[PDB]
Amino acid sequence: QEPGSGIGYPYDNNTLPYVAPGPTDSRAPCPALNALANHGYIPHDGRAISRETLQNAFLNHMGIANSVIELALTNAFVVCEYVTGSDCGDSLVNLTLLAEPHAFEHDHSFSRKDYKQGVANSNDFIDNRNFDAETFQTSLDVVAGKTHFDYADMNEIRLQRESLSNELDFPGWFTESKPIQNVESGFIFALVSDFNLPDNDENPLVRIDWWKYWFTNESFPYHLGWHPPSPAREIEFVTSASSAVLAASVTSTPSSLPSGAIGPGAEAVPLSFASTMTPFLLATNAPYYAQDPTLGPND
Numbered sequence: 477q478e479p480g481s482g483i484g485y486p487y488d489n490n491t492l493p494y495v496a497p498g499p500t501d502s503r504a505p506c507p508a509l510n511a512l513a514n515h516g517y518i519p520h521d522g523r524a525i526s527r528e529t530l531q532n533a534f535l536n537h538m539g540i541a542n543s544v545i546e547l548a549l550t551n552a553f554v555v556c557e558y559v560t561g562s563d564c565g566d567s568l569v570n571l572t573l574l575a576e577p578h579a580f581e582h583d584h585s586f587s588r589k590d591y592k593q594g595v596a597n598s599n600d601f602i603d604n605r606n607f608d609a610e611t612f613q614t615s616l617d618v619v620a621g622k623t624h625f626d627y628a629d630m631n632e633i634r635l636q637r638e639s640l641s642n643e644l645d646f647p648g649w650f651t652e653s654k655p656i657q658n659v660e661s662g663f664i665f666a667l668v669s670d671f672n673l674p675d676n677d678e679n680p681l682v683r684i685d686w687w688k689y690w691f692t693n694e695s696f697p698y699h700l701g702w703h704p705p706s707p708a709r710e711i712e713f714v715t716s717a718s719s720a721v722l723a724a725s726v727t728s729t730p731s732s733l734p735s736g737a738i739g740p741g742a743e744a745v746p747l748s749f750a751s752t753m754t755p756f757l758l759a760t761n762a763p764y765y766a767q768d769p770t771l772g773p774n775d
C-alpha cells in the first residue's frame with residue numbers, strides 16, 4: 477500500500493503500492509512472488525533478481541523467514557540454469573522461467589492449469605503459469621460454504637486436484653509431485669492461517685477469504701485483517717504442516733488417483749537436470765492481473 481497509508485503498521489512499516497504488471501513484465505507461477513513483484517519488493521518487471529532481494533522481500537513484507545525459502549532459492553537457480561543453458565550466478569533471469577514444467581513447476585497445482593491439461597494433441601501446451609479462476613474454483617469447491625479449513629481439508633483439496641489433473645492431462649503427461657506441492661500446502665498455512673485464533677501455531681486453520689484474496693488478486697489481504705505473521709514463520713512450521721496434511725485421514729477418496737497418492741510424502745530435495753535435456757518451451761502469455769475489479773494502489 478502507499479507508504480503514508482499505514483495499512484501495514486506496525487507489522488510492515490515500509491510498504492509500497494500495488495501496481496498491475498504490464499504486458500512486457502515477467503511473472504511467475506507463484507502467487508507469493510507475483511504479489512512481491514506487483515509491490516516492487518522484488519523488481520516490478522520480474523527480472524534480474526538476487527537471492528538477498530528475495531530473502532528481504534519475504535522477511536520484511538510477508539513475515540516469511542529466510543529458512544522457509546532456502547530450498548526454493550536453490551531450486552529457482554537450478555531451473556534458471558536449466559532453462560537458459562548457463563549458470564545465472566545471483567541474478568535470476570526472470571520469474572517466467574520458473575514455470576518450466578516437470579521441474580519446480582509441477583502438475584496438479586491449486587490454481588493453475590497443467591502444461592498439457594486438456595490438449596487434443598501431444599505436442600500442444602497451454603498456460604501453466606497464470607492464475608486460472610476455474611482451476612482455483614475446483615480447489616475452493618472442496619471447502620464450499622466454509623470460512624476456515626484444517627489439515628485434513630487441505631489433504632482433500634490436493635487429492636481432488638491430483639484426480640482432476642490425472643483425468644484431464646494428455647495421456648502420459650501427468651506426474652505426481654507430492655513433495656513440492658505439500659511444501660506449498662505448508663506455505664499456505666504459514667501465510668494465511670488465522671493467527672487471531674489462540675491455538676494457531678499448534679493447530680492452524682486457513683482463512684479462506686485471505687487465501688482467495690491473495691491468489692486472485694496477487695496482493696495482500698490487509699483489508700480483510702491480514703498482516704505478515706509476527707514473528708516471521710520458519711521452515712519447521714512449513715514442513716510440519718506439510719507432513720500433517722499428508723498424515724491426515726482421508727474420508728472422501730476421489731477416483732483416478734495416481735499410485736500412492738494417499739499417505740506420507742518424500743522430503744522435497746534439490747532439483748537436478750541432465751545436461752543433454754532440452755527444456756520444454758515456456759508458455760508466452762502476458763502476465764495475469766485482477767480485472768474484476770482492477771486493484772488500486774492500496775489493495
Ligand code: HEM
Pocket residue numbers: 505506507508509530534540544545548549552574575580581582583584585586587588660661663664666667
Ligand atoms: C524464492 C522463493 C520461491 C520460489 C522460487 C517459488 C517458486 C514457485 C513455483 C515455481 C511454483 C509453481 C508450483 C506449481 O504450482 O506448479 C510455486 C507455487 C506456489 N508458491 Fe511459491 N516459491 C517461493 C516462495 C514461496 C513462499 C514463501 C510462499 C508462501 C509462504 C509461496 C507460495 C506458493 C504457493 C501457495 C504455490 C502453489 C500455487 C498453486 O498450486 O496454485 N511461494 N512457487
Ligand SMILES: *[C@@H]1O[C@H](CO)[C@@H](O[C@@H]2O[C@H](CO)[C@@H](O[C@@H]3O[C@H](CO)[C@@H](O)[C@H](O)[C@@H]3O)[C@H](O)[C@H]2NC(C)=O)[C@H](O)[C@H]1NC(C)=O
Pocket residue numbers: 500501502503559560569570571572573755756757758759
Ligand atoms: C524469461 O526468460 C526465458 C529464458 O530466457 C524466456 O524464454 C526464452 O525466450 C527466448 C526468446 O527471447 C526463446 O528463444 C527463442 O527460441 C526459439 C526456439 O528455440 C528460437 O527459434 C529463437 O530464435 C529464440 O532463440 C526461448 O525459446 C525461451 N525459452 C524457453 C525454454 O521457452 C522468456 O521469454 C522470458 N520471459 C519474459 C516474460 O521475460
Ligand SMILES: *[C@@H]1O[C@H](CO)[C@@H](O[C@@H]2O[C@H](CO)[C@@H](O)[C@H](O)[C@H]2NC(C)=O)[C@H](O)[C@H]1NC(C)=O
Pocket residue numbers: 685688689690692693699700766769771772775
Ligand atoms: C481483490 O481485491 C479487491 C480490492 O481490495 C476486493 O474488492 C473489495 O472487496 C471487499 C470485500 O471484502 C468490498 O468491501 C470492497 O468494496 C471491494 N472493493 C472493490 C473495489 O470492489 C476483492 O474482493 C478481492 N478479491 C478477492 C477474491 O478477495
Ligand SMILES: *[C@H]1O[C@H](CO)[C@@H](O)[C@H](O)[C@@H]1O[C@H]1O[C@H](CO)[C@@H](O)[C@H](O)[C@@H]1O
Pocket residue numbers: 759760761762
Ligand atoms: C505467447 O506468445 C507467442 C508469440 O510471442 C505465441 O506464439 C503463443 O501462442 C503465446 O500467445 C499467447 O500470449 C500472447 C501474449 O503475448 C498473446 O498475444 C496471444 O494472443 C496468446 O494469448
Ligand SMILES: *[C@@H]1O[C@H](CO)[C@@H](O)[C@H](O)[C@H]1NC(C)=O
Pocket residue numbers: 485486487488489
Ligand atoms: C513499526 O514502527 C513502530 C513504531 O516505531 C515500532 O513499534 C514497530 O516495531 C515497527 N515494526 C517493525 C516490524 O519494525
Ligand SMILES: *[C@H]1O[C@H](CO)[C@@H](O)[C@H](O)[C@@H]1O
Pocket residue numbers: 654655656657658659662714715716718719722740741742743744
Ligand atoms: C512437505 O514436507 C513434508 C516433511 O518434509 C514432506 O513429507 C512432504 O512430502 C512435503 O514435501
Ligand SMILES: *[C@H]1O[C@H](CO)[C@@H](O)[C@H](O)[C@@H]1O
Pocket residue numbers: 711712713714715716719743744
Ligand atoms: C518438517 O520436516 C523437516 C524435514 O523435512 C524437519 O526438519 C522439520 O523440523 C519439520 O518437521
Ligand SMILES: *[C@H]1O[C@H](CO)[C@@H](O)[C@H](O)[C@@H]1O
Pocket residue numbers: 677678679680712713716717720
Ligand atoms: C509441526 O508444527 C505444526 C505447525 O506448528 C503443527 O501443526 C504440527 O502438529 C507439528 O507440531
Ligand SMILES: *[C@H]1O[C@H](CO)[C@@H](O)[C@H](O)[C@@H]1O
Pocket residue numbers: 715716717719720723
Ligand atoms: C510429519 O510431521 C507431522 C506433524 O508433526 C506428523 O503428523 C506426521 O506423522 C509426520 O511425522
Ligand SMILES: *[C@H]1O[C@H](CO)[C@@H](O)[C@H](O)[C@@H]1O
Pocket residue numbers: 724725726727
Ligand atoms: C482415517 O480416519 C478417518 C476418520 O474420519 C476414516 O474416515 C478414514 O478411513 C481413515 O481411517
Ligand SMILES: *[C@H]1O[C@H](CO)[C@@H](O)[C@H](O)[C@@H]1O
Pocket residue numbers: 618628629632726727728
Ligand atoms: C470427510 O471429511 C472431509 C474433510 O475432512 C470432507 O471433504 C469429506 O467430504 C468427508 O466429509
Ligand SMILES: *[C@H]1O[C@H](CO)[C@@H](O)[C@H](O)[C@@H]1O
Pocket residue numbers: 618632633635636727728729730731
Ligand atoms: C469427498 O471429497 C472428495 C475430494 O474433495 C471428492 O472427490 C469426493 O467426490 C467426495 O465429495
Ligand SMILES: *[C@H]1O[C@H](CO)[C@@H](O)[C@H](O)[C@@H]1O
Pocket residue numbers: 725726727728729730738
Ligand atoms: C477413500 O478410499 C481410500 C481407498 O479405499 C481410503 O484410503 C480413504 O481413507 C478413503 O476412505
Ligand SMILES: *[C@H]1O[C@H](CO)[C@@H](O)[C@H](O)[C@@H]1O
Pocket residue numbers: 769770771772
Ligand atoms: C483498476 O483500474 C480501473 C480502470 O478503469 C479502475 O476502474 C479501478 O478503480 C482500478 O483502479
Ligand SMILES: [Br-]
Pocket residue numbers: 502523569570
Ligand atoms: Br528476461
Ligand SMILES: [Br-]
Pocket residue numbers: 593594644
Ligand atoms: Br480441461
